[PDB]
């Protein structure tokens with residue numbers, strides 16, 4: 001499974017998402033417990049704009065590695081990109097429980113409240129992000 005996975009990765013890194021998907025599927029045939037292959041299959045679908053499918057695969061990754069702050073954050077992002085800001089909030093909160101020093105997750109939580117039109121909550125979360133990383 002690991003060799004098919006790394007071939008998929010090489011195709012992903014050169015922007016060839018169709019090929020990445022084919023080789024992650026082959027990895028998952030050989031090892032259905034690869035949280036990494038489910039996650040990167042999600043990412044490949046995310047890059048194609050296929051957020052519905054990205055969410056399915058991130059959920060499978062999180063069944064195997066529920067302590068994946070990465071999968072929780074990208075699951076949030078897949079809802080954010082669809083305009084599903086209240087769903088994004090739930091998954092960003094889960095990412096931040098696992099990694100409370102993620103400036104990214106605090107910032108995107110603030111963005112989700114901003115998009116909901118809750119500016120006072122956006123301010124609170126942006127202030128927390130900027131406390132962690134004041135350079136953006």
Ligand SMILES: [Ca+2]
Nearest residue numbers: 050051052053
């Ligand atoms: Ca659909």
Ligand SMILES: [Ca+2]
Nearest residue numbers: 051052053082
């Ligand atoms: Ca849909």
Ligand SMILES: [Ca+2]
Nearest residue numbers: 050051052053
């Ligand atoms: Ca489809």
Ligand SMILES: [Ca+2]
Nearest residue numbers: 065067068069
């Ligand atoms: Ca983890």
Ligand SMILES: [Ca+2]
Nearest residue numbers: 051052082083
């Ligand atoms: Ca949608």
Ligand SMILES: [Ca+2]
Nearest residue numbers: 084085086087
């Ligand atoms: Ca909603």
